[PDB]
Design an enzyme around this catalytic site. Sequence first.
Site, PDB file in Angstrom:
ATOM      1  N   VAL A  30     -21.215 190.415  54.598  1.00 57.72           N
ATOM      2  CA  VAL A  30     -22.223 190.147  55.641  1.00 57.72           C
ATOM      3  C   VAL A  30     -23.597 189.751  55.080  1.00 57.72           C
ATOM      4  O   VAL A  30     -24.420 189.199  55.810  1.00 57.72           O
ATOM      5  CB  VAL A  30     -22.344 191.263  56.718  1.00 57.72           C
ATOM      6  CG1 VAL A  30     -21.072 191.350  57.551  1.00 57.72           C
ATOM      7  CG2 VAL A  30     -22.700 192.613  56.109  1.00 57.72           C
ATOM      8  N   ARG A  66     -26.537 189.976  51.272  1.00 53.69           N
ATOM      9  CA  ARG A  66     -27.090 190.728  50.157  1.00 53.69           C
ATOM     10  C   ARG A  66     -28.226 191.574  50.696  1.00 53.69           C
ATOM     11  O   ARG A  66     -29.107 191.066  51.406  1.00 53.69           O
ATOM     12  CB  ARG A  66     -27.592 189.808  49.045  1.00 53.69           C
ATOM     13  CG  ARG A  66     -26.501 189.277  48.123  1.00 53.69           C
ATOM     14  N   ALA A  83     -31.485 194.252  49.730  1.00 51.22           N
ATOM     15  CA  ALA A  83     -32.588 194.152  48.767  1.00 51.22           C
ATOM     16  C   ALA A  83     -32.043 194.242  47.334  1.00 51.22           C
ATOM     17  O   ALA A  83     -32.546 193.571  46.446  1.00 51.22           O
ATOM     18  CB  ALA A  83     -33.650 195.214  49.030  1.00 51.22           C
ATOM     19  N   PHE A  84     -31.021 195.079  47.142  1.00 54.86           N
ATOM     20  CA  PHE A  84     -30.108 195.011  45.987  1.00 54.86           C
ATOM     21  C   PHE A  84     -28.665 195.017  46.507  1.00 54.86           C
ATOM     22  O   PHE A  84     -28.410 195.358  47.676  1.00 54.86           O
ATOM     23  CB  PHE A  84     -30.326 196.190  45.023  1.00 54.86           C
ATOM     24  CG  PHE A  84     -29.762 197.496  45.523  1.00 54.86           C
ATOM     25  CD1 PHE A  84     -30.495 198.300  46.402  1.00 54.86           C
ATOM     26  CD2 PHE A  84     -28.484 197.919  45.131  1.00 54.86           C
ATOM     27  CE1 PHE A  84     -29.971 199.500  46.872  1.00 54.86           C
ATOM     28  CE2 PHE A  84     -27.952 199.114  45.608  1.00 54.86           C
ATOM     29  CZ  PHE A  84     -28.697 199.907  46.475  1.00 54.86           C
ATOM     30  N   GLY A  85     -27.736 194.640  45.627  1.00 52.25           N
ATOM     31  CA  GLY A  85     -26.304 194.723  45.890  1.00 52.25           C
ATOM     32  C   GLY A  85     -25.781 193.781  46.955  1.00 52.25           C
ATOM     33  O   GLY A  85     -26.489 192.889  47.438  1.00 52.25           O
ATOM     34  N   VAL A  92     -23.477 193.585  50.642  1.00 48.10           N
ATOM     35  CA  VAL A  92     -23.082 194.353  51.815  1.00 48.10           C
ATOM     36  C   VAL A  92     -21.881 193.684  52.472  1.00 48.10           C
ATOM     37  O   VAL A  92     -21.886 192.477  52.739  1.00 48.10           O
ATOM     38  CB  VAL A  92     -24.257 194.544  52.825  1.00 48.10           C
ATOM     39  CG1 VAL A  92     -23.862 195.481  53.955  1.00 48.10           C
ATOM     40  CG2 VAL A  92     -25.499 195.087  52.129  1.00 48.10           C
ATOM     41  N   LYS A 141     -22.099 198.974  50.622  1.00 53.95           N
ATOM     42  CA  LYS A 141     -23.004 198.305  49.709  1.00 53.95           C
ATOM     43  C   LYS A 141     -22.563 198.585  48.284  1.00 53.95           C
ATOM     44  O   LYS A 141     -22.508 199.739  47.862  1.00 53.95           O
ATOM     45  CB  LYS A 141     -24.464 198.712  49.961  1.00 53.95           C
ATOM     46  CG  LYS A 141     -25.468 198.184  48.942  1.00 53.95           C
ATOM     47  CD  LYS A 141     -26.810 197.760  49.542  1.00 53.95           C
ATOM     48  CE  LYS A 141     -27.553 198.889  50.240  1.00 53.95           C
ATOM     49  NZ  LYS A 141     -29.036 198.767  50.131  1.00 53.95           N
ATOM     50  N   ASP A 183     -41.095 198.844  50.664  1.00 49.05           N
ATOM     51  CA  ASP A 183     -40.553 197.492  50.854  1.00 49.05           C
ATOM     52  C   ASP A 183     -40.220 197.219  52.332  1.00 49.05           C
ATOM     53  O   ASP A 183     -39.160 196.655  52.657  1.00 49.05           O
ATOM     54  CB  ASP A 183     -39.316 197.297  49.958  1.00 49.05           C
ATOM     55  CG  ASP A 183     -38.874 195.849  49.862  1.00 49.05           C
ATOM     56  OD1 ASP A 183     -39.735 194.941  49.898  1.00 49.05           O
ATOM     57  OD2 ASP A 183     -37.652 195.624  49.751  1.00 49.05           O
TER      58      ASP A 183
HETATM   59  C1  LIG Z   1     -20.644 187.351  63.043  1.00 48.56           C
HETATM   60  N1  LIG Z   1     -21.459 188.485  62.603  1.00 48.56           N
HETATM   61  C2  LIG Z   1     -21.493 188.574  61.145  1.00 48.56           C
HETATM   62  C3  LIG Z   1     -22.223 189.860  60.701  1.00 48.56           C
HETATM   63  N2  LIG Z   1     -23.561 190.043  61.332  1.00 48.56           N
HETATM   64  C4  LIG Z   1     -24.684 190.058  60.565  1.00 48.56           C
HETATM   65  O1  LIG Z   1     -25.454 189.108  60.519  1.00 48.56           O
HETATM   66  C5  LIG Z   1     -25.006 191.297  59.761  1.00 48.56           C
HETATM   67  C6  LIG Z   1     -24.456 192.535  60.103  1.00 48.56           C
HETATM   68  C7  LIG Z   1     -24.759 193.674  59.372  1.00 48.56           C
HETATM   69  C8  LIG Z   1     -25.638 193.611  58.277  1.00 48.56           C
HETATM   70  N3  LIG Z   1     -25.962 194.777  57.519  1.00 48.56           N
HETATM   71  C9  LIG Z   1     -25.680 196.085  57.782  1.00 48.56           C
HETATM   72  O2  LIG Z   1     -24.992 196.474  58.725  1.00 48.56           O
HETATM   73  C10 LIG Z   1     -26.273 197.074  56.840  1.00 48.56           C
HETATM   74  C11 LIG Z   1     -25.989 198.430  56.919  1.00 48.56           C
HETATM   75  S1  LIG Z   1     -26.800 199.340  55.720  1.00 48.56           S
HETATM   76  C12 LIG Z   1     -27.517 197.907  55.125  1.00 48.56           C
HETATM   77  C13 LIG Z   1     -28.421 197.915  54.017  1.00 48.56           C
HETATM   78  O3  LIG Z   1     -28.769 198.906  53.384  1.00 48.56           O
HETATM   79  N4  LIG Z   1     -28.895 196.649  53.708  1.00 48.56           N
HETATM   80  C14 LIG Z   1     -28.530 195.519  54.376  1.00 48.56           C
HETATM   81  N5  LIG Z   1     -27.714 195.482  55.402  1.00 48.56           N
HETATM   82  C15 LIG Z   1     -27.196 196.747  55.770  1.00 48.56           C
HETATM   83  C16 LIG Z   1     -26.207 192.362  57.918  1.00 48.56           C
HETATM   84  C17 LIG Z   1     -27.136 192.208  56.777  1.00 48.56           C
HETATM   85  C18 LIG Z   1     -28.507 192.045  56.986  1.00 48.56           C
HETATM   86  C19 LIG Z   1     -29.380 191.894  55.906  1.00 48.56           C
HETATM   87  C20 LIG Z   1     -28.893 191.897  54.610  1.00 48.56           C
HETATM   88  C21 LIG Z   1     -27.539 192.052  54.384  1.00 48.56           C
HETATM   89  C22 LIG Z   1     -26.662 192.208  55.458  1.00 48.56           C
HETATM   90  C23 LIG Z   1     -25.879 191.217  58.668  1.00 48.56           C
HETATM   91  C24 LIG Z   1     -23.640 189.674  62.772  1.00 48.56           C
HETATM   92  C25 LIG Z   1     -22.830 188.386  63.115  1.00 48.56           C
END
Ligand SMILES: CN1CCN(C(=O)c2ccc(NC(=O)c3csc4c(=O)[nH]cnc34)c(-c3ccccc3)c2)CC1
EC number: 2.7.11.25
Length: 296
Positions: free
Chosen positions: A17, A19, A21-23, A25, A38, A131
């Site tokens: 889904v 990246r 801030a690190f790693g 996801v 993550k 951050d």
């Molecule tokens: C079709 N569908 C695809 C998935 N979705 C997302 O756009 C979508 C959905 C979920 C996400 N993340 C989490 O649930 C998440 C849980 S803990 C954590 C963290 O510590 N750091 C970054 N993200 C997360 C992200 C996302 C956001 C920023 C950076 C990395 C990941 C994008 C919605 C639309």
Amino acid sequence: GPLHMIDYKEIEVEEVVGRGAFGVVCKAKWRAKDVAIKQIESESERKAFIVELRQLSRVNHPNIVKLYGACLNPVCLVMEYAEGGSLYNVLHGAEPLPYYTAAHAMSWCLQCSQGVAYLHSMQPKALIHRDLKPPNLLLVAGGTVLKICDFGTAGSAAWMAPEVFEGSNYSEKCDVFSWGIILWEVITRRKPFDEIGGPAFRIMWAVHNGTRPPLIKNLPKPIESLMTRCWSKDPSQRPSMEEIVKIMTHLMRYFPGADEPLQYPCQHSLPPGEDGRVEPYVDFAEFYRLWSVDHG
Ligand SMILES: CN1CCN(C(=O)c2ccc(NC(=O)c3csc4c(=O)[nH]cnc34)c(-c3ccccc3)c2)CC1
């Protein structure tokens, strides 16, 4: 409190889904529940990992992402999955973008301040996020509930207090500056310091010299005061998060509808600033009407 040592075999990893801030996801399933996992990629990301594992396991608040557990084969965190993605993507991502209201904008910032005030009240030491920015703010429940994430430090120059990059000693007041920039950002639906760009040091120089985002046309004076106080050069002139929570809580009386899910489409592009000021993306006509009824 509750923290599971998780067997990786129990995790059905779906798609990547993004990246953090690190790693990296990934959307996943674990105990028939949707989770985010993550995973560290580099060996360098191990520091941020231990930090985040320690910090996130300490915290329990409705506006901070839930940590269910950790796996060590391989090294990964198992967290709450945020179906609404990041605030940054809601604000600035690929079209079609959602419509949102002044009530949403204020509600998101209130909820962010509530999470951060909880962090700043931890014993025996305050937890500083360091951050705070919309990439690290997640949305759930149809875009109506905000959760802080990415505690690996508990790209970022546009939200950073000048005393932080000046190598100067700093306090929890750095998070307050970041919050002020976010408030401007959700109201304007603009990227802070987008016009500067270049590499990061150009933003740092500008902010260091006292450059702040442009003022907002027709912004209510109390919101303007709060915003510009938060971005004071002198950290001691910035309000505490406790004060921000209180002010924002009382302002919500004049911003009904924050519980409405993001569901309406929006076609959005930016007109440049007419004077030195910018137009808000959100509308304050209703705020002024409701204020006038209450006051006279
Ligand atoms: C079709 N569908 C695809 C998935 N979705 C997302 O756009 C979508 C959905 C979920 C996400 N993340 C989490 O649930 C998440 C849980 S803990 C954590 C963290 O510590 N750091 C970054 N993200 C997360 C992200 C996302 C956001 C920023 C950076 C990395 C990941 C994008 C919605 C639309």
